[PDB]
Design a protein around this ligand. Structure first.
Ligand SMILES: [Cl-]
Ligand SMILES: [Cl-]
Ligand SMILES: [Cl-]
Ligand SMILES: [Cl-]
Ligand code: NA
Ligand code: NA
Ligand SMILES: [Zn+2]
Ligand SMILES: [Zn+2]
Ligand SMILES: [Zn+2]
Ligand SMILES: [Zn+2]
Length: 98
């Protein structure tokens, strides 16, 4: 395989992942809960890309967060708009389509 952009836009349109959401009406900007049992977008992406199969691999979140940051930062039309990942209340990042 899947490509990060179409897969991401789909996850966001569906709105089934807690805290993972469009933040503007035009749907060029979105939130990922991010903190420096999750079952969130990092593991979902690992499963979609075959990097994680339950019971085959041991759970590795820091790696999932790394693989996922890597796939996102490489996309030319994706900018990191905001880094709130150290916030105590709701740690998150905002990404934008440029
Ligand atoms: Cl749509
Ligand atoms: Cl998951
Ligand atoms: Cl605050
Ligand atoms: Cl905040
Ligand atoms: Na949400
Ligand atoms: Na996760
Ligand atoms: Zn859409
Ligand atoms: Zn899963
Ligand atoms: Zn924010
Ligand atoms: Zn705060």
């Amino acid at each position: 395989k899947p490509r990060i952009l179409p897969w991401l836009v789909s996850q966001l349109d569906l709105g089934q992942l807690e805290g993972v959401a469009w933040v503007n009406k035009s749907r060029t900007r979105f939130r990922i809960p991010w903190k420096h049992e999750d079952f969130g977008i990092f593991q979902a992406w690992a499963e979609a890309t075959g990097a994680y199969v339950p019971g085959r691999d041991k759970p590795d979140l820091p790696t999932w967060k790394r693989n996922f940051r890597s796939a996102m930062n490489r996309k030319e039309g994706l900018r990191l708009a905001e880094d709130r990942s150290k916030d105590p209340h709701d740690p998150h990042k905002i990404y934008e389509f440029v």
